[PDB]
Amino acid sequence: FVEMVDNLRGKSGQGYYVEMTVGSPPQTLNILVDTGSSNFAVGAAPHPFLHRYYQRQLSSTYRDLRKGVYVPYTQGKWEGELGTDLVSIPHGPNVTVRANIAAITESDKFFINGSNWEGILGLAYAEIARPDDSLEPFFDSLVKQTHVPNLFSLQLCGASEVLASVGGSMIIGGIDHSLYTGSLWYTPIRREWYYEVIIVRVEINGQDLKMDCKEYNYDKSIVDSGTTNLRLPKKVFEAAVKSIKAASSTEKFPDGFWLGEQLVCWQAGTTPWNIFPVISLYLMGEVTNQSFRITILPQQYLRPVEDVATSQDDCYKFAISQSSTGTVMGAVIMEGFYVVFDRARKRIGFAVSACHVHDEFRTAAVEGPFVTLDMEDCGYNIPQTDESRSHHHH
Ligand SMILES: CC(C)Oc1cccc(CN2CC[C@@]3(C[C@@H]2C)CN(C)S(=O)(=O)N3c2cccc(F)c2)c1
Ligand SMILES: [Zn+2]
Numbered sequence: 001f002v003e004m005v006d007n008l009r010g011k012s013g014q015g016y017y018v019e020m021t022v023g024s025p026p027q028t029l030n031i032l033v034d035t036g037s038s039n040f041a042v043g044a045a046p047h048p049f050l051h052r053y054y055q056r057q058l059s060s061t062y063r064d065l066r067k068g069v070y071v072p073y074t075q076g077k078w079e080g081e082l083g084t085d086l087v088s089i090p091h092g093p094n095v096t097v098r099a100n101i102a103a104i105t106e107s108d109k110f111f112i113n114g115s116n117w118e119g120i121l122g123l124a125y126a127e128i129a130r131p132d133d134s135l136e137p138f139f140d141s142l143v144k145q146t147h148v149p150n151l152f153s154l155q156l157c158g159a160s161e162v163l164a165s166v167g168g169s170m171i172i173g174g175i176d177h178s179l180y181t182g183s184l185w186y187t188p189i190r191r192e193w194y195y196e197v198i199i200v201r202v203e204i205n206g207q208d209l210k211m212d213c214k215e216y217n218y219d220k221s222i223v224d225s226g227t228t229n230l231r232l233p234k235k236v237f238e239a240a241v242k243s244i245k246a247a248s249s250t251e252k253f254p255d256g257f258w259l260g261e262q263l264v265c266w267q268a269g270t271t272p273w274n275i276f277p278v279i280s281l282y283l284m285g286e287v288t289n290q291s292f293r294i295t296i297l298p299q300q301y302l303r304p305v306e307d308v309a310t311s312q313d314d315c316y317k318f319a320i321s322q323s324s325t326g327t328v329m330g331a332v333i334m335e336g337f338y339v340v341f342d343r344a345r346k347r348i349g350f351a352v353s354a355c356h357v358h359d360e361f362r363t364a365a366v367e368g369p370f371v372t373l374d375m376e377d378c379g380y381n382i383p384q385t386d387e388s389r390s391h392h393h394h
Contacts, residue, residue, distance in 0.1 A: 035223055037128065050118050068080065124193065158355075185368050186348065198284040207243065219325065248276055251275060278295050300319075337356070
């Protein structure tokens with residue numbers, strides 16, 4: 001799928017985007033690739049952080065749905081007008097789809113200054129689409145309207161006045177064998193809403209965290225290309241950081257470092273990578289009682305940032321952070337691997353990425369099988385609110 005290799009770009013820590021065209025004539029837009037949301041939404045009015053926006057009135061193929069949408073999150077929000085229009089991905093399949101499109105008219109702390117993207121491509125399922133699950137996500141429309149297989153795969157490749165440029169591949173409708181090495185291991189998608197998975201075990205430098213495995217998935221664990229960090233539930237983050245601190249103890253970093261709010265530096269090329277441990281997440285296998293592990297290096301969890309005030313040093317940000325909404329396997333995890341979102345088979349595949357950052361001593365790894373007799377259920381059941389229970393699903 002050569003035509004789709006290297007079709008993603010971005011700035012380190014500001015997301016990966018794909019170029020898309022919307023309307024007739026086609027309006028070129030850079031769109032955030034987000035497996036953690038399900039709406040196709042685009043800046044549609046001026047904003048200080050946008051180099052352009054979607055102009056609905058200028059598309060001959062635009063159809064107004066005469067319905068607005070309000071999308072609040074913890075860290076930001078967007079609102080807009082719903083409609084449909086012709087959509088294509090120039091470095092994607094040779095097809096045009098009529099998809100739903102939310103024209104963003106108002107937002108707060110959503111767009112990022114310098115990110116070079118003006119919209120979002122929510123690749124997750126209809127269950128989490130706003131306003132409700134009847135608003136068909138883009139990927140669902142693409143599959144229904146064309147002969148494109150119900151699968152996509154992501155190879156996110158990790159990195160003085162600007163942030164480092166990043167690259168990647170979104171292979172729509174297939175798996176490209178040049179993007180990975182070794183075996184491709186699959187973990188079941190628990191439920192089709194977010195790309196929800198189950199973590200059965202966590203090790204830091206081969207050492208088991210020894211927590212009740214439901215703690216790893218409290219309240220869920222998701223694969224999210226739209227999130228930079230590896231985000232872990234409070235108790236898990238504490239145990240993990242305690243362990244990384246102990247292995248790296250010859251270096252006494254400020255508190256701000258471990259909170260992910262401060263860079264730590266070393267003379268160029270002298271970074272002591274070997275004092276930092278590998279992190280292994282064991283994911284539920286397709287077979288009962290089996291698991292496989294995905295192992296990341298500090299090259300994935302220590303994000304490179306070039307200091308204006310310290311240009312001659314290699315500086316890093318700690319990219320593991322606390323969560324109150326479960327585990328989020330963001331770019332920190334994804335950059336080590338080629339990830340296959342096999343929707344047709346309700347499973348997620350992981351293989352060692354041909355582009356992952358490593359050294360001469362260690363590599364990111366995907367290894368299995370690991371067996372457990374009479375394996376306990378590691379899944380958490382989210383308390384059901386009266387509001388969600390009341391929803392009908394016709
Ligand atoms: C590329 C990254 C760096 O920035 C992003 C900017 C916009 C959307 C996304 C994708 N994605 C990231 C996580 C998300 C939901 C959002 C769609 C869920 N979380 C619970 S959240 O509230 O943090 N939240 C978030 C983060 C920033 C702004 C916002 F409104 C919500 C990422
Ligand atoms: Zn009903």
